[PDB]
Ligand SMILES: Nc1nc2c(c(=O)[nH]1)N[C@H]1C(S)=C(S)[C@@H](COP(=O)(O)OP(=O)(O)OC[C@H]3O[C@@H](n4cnc5c(=O)[nH]c(N)nc54)[C@H](O)[C@@H]3O)O[C@H]1N2
Ligand SMILES: Nc1nc2c(c(=O)[nH]1)N[C@H]1C(S)=C(S)[C@@H](COP(=O)(O)OP(=O)(O)OC[C@H]3O[C@@H](n4cnc5c(=O)[nH]c(N)nc54)[C@H](O)[C@@H]3O)O[C@H]1N2
């Protein structure tokens with residue numbers, strides 16, 4: 001069938017598999033893994049069933065306007081839509097200042113789209129109200145990397161998986177969430193049976209079936225668990241003083257300078273016999289995990305939402321880094337502290353791109369007066385155009401919309417009416433009778449469209465070209481494989497036309513296409529520790545991704561950051577083999593963060609922990625994977641997981657309709673009684689739009705990253 005294969009990237013998870021899209025007579029007919037990208041030709045079942053999604057007729061294909069709140073969506077021309085969008089936004093700024101408008105985007109947006117949007121808002125409008133769904137996700141890992149190393153993003157790559165001799169896998173259901181990486185992990189243990197795997201997660205998932213040890217600790221007690229591991233490492237003389245004496249600093253519980261002796265004193269509060277009882281685990285798991293971690297030749301940690309979606313998320317990230325820093329299990333092949341990124345482009349588009357409320361592109365910060373001046377110079381802005389104040393972070397943004405402080409919002413390639421925490425609160429904010437909400441959305445069944453005043457039809461996935469930056473610092477091009485249907489337009493172009501019409505200086509949006517923007521972005525990264533100047537559109541066309549830092553066309557890219565001879569940001573003649581250059585003295589920092597718990601812990605009235613999780617067949621809100629019949633055959637609808645020994649004790653059996661109730665709402669769900677959830681925990685998925693589980697969850701956030709605690713709240717269950 002296919003006459004040609006078009007190279008791109010899988011639409012789904014931050015594993016970032018390359019994809020070849022097979023096309024015949026302008027239509028996509030087949031898909032295979034890119035043999036030259038890291039996945040080496042392999043896709044999971046989601047990746048492999050992308051053609052039905054791309055070919056679906058169930059698409060937003062024309063602009064729609066709701067003339068009045070509560071009205072119905074009706075057809076409207078592109079020009080009328082762009083004029084309406086431009087005049088409302090312009091008028092808002094004219095009347096109330098830039099802070100009355102906001103961008104709410106996505107880690108699924110092309111890097112180029114998020115770049116243009118971020119520039120329009122911060123540089124054109126003069127507001128820093130640019131945030132996005134990675135606030136819900138990766139913000140705690142950013143905080144953890146910036147506080148430990150002074151720079152965002154992993155220092156290792158997926159390649160370290162192939163030399164790791166121990167895996168510490170915490171708050172990650174890698175099997176269901178990163179299937180191609182899970183297979184690479186399983187394969188490593190297959191090829192070297194000596195490889196040790198620790199899986200640390202209150203639920204027993206498919207990820208545990210390759211583990212030497214499954215640590216089913218009590219929700220929120222993992223900080224005490226990880227401090228206790230460090231206590232064992234030091235107590236049994238398994239630390240690395242040649243490393244930490246030269247390359248580490250110590251900060252105490254107050255965030256003040258300290259030392260190794262201070263660290264040991266602090267760790268006395270986390271002895272294994274005490275912590276085992278806090279965590280509800282056998283004491284031998286603490287010793288066993290610590291010893292596996294520190295005795296192994298090369299140890300790699302991997303983690304995702306169970307660690308990040310936490311009011312102690314930044315701190316929990318810090319503790320993982322602590323373990324690597326005290327042992328020097330870092331900056332060597334196989335040995336690294338690796339945050340897993342959930343979305344295909346949270347890394348490239350939002351974090352690296354600085355498309356969050358407090359950031360500027362390529363490692364710059366809003367509160368830094370010098371970073372503002374650098375961006376005004378790079379972007380051709382008048383002096384002081386960039387507001388000194390961070391804009392609203394996602395949770396505060398929707399609160400601001402609720403108050404009427406934010407009057408005009410663009411929502412793009414994300415579905416916040418389904419996925420924000422505390423939905424009953426959120427749905428009210430999104431119903432402000434004087435709000436103007438514009439949605440750029442590919443599928444009509446996204447529940448957010450029920451709040452939209454204006455809906456614009458986007459080009460989907462490989463209907464246009466653009467870069468995705470996955471979890472390992474790999475930036476990969478998707479070339480255009482097919483035309484968009486109907487009146488669908490590339491969002492890069494829509495954003496440019498919107499800005500022009502809203503009175504933005506045309507010098508600020510001088511872009512015909514995504515390649516034009518990519519070239520300006522390259523220049524804005526030049527000289528920074530992100531420098532990807534060497535990633536020309538032409539190299540990205542021929543390559544299956546390049547890994548930053550990559551400062552010139554003759555540069556291969558970078559696998560080991562902070563390492564002399566590997567990282568071009570480390571001077572060739574630096575006195576030391578390693579250089580944590582994001583800190584002013586080149587040293588990484590161990591943080592003695594106190595272990596606490598969730599914002600909403602169980603009590604007499606709500607005695608269970610409630611968590612939320614993923615499932616392999618379904619992608620987030622299922623507006624895409626929902627179009628694939630094969631993906632509906634195992635878990636067609638939501639359920640609640642309940643512990644066996646909990647349920648029997650409370651007269652609940654498998655299949656029973658149960659009421660799950662928090663302080664915020666109550667929902668009926670079929671009971672899925674087993675040993676997956678440890679005792680005292682229940683668990684709901686969020687893929688089902690008929691069961692908006694975020695109505696049950698609380699909005700409490702990490703006070704630094706502002707990531708919501710989706711992983712923990714308090715609940716009760718009773719038979720319906
Ligand atoms: N199939 C599929 N894959 C995906 C996605 C999808 O929608 N579908 N989405 C992608 C995105 S954007 C992301 S963020 C990743 C998410 O990937 P994961 O975070 O790996 O998946 P979750 O099920 O949300 O992960 C939560 C795991 O953390 C656990 N957890 C709960 N409480 C705690 C705690 O107190 N401590 C610890 N340490 N763990 C806890 C839960 O038991 C759960 O099994 O998946 C990505 N991959
Ligand atoms: N309870 C609970 N809630 C959670 C989580 C959890 O673990 N538990 N996880 C959180 C995390 S980590 C994340 S990443 C978020 C993700 O949450 P969302 O981002 O809200 O979920 P998605 O379904 O990925 O949203 C992508 C949207 O883009 C649309 N779309 C697809 N292609 C295109 C395109 O080209 N253009 C446009 N405009 N739209 C397109 C899809 O139809 C869909 O509505 O959810 C968060 N919510």
Ligand code: SF4
Nearest residue numbers: 010012013017044047
């Ligand atoms: S592991 Fe992730 S990126 Fe790879 S094919 Fe599966 S969904 Fe796509």
Ligand SMILES: [Mo]
Nearest residue numbers: 136137342343
């Ligand atoms: Mo995510």
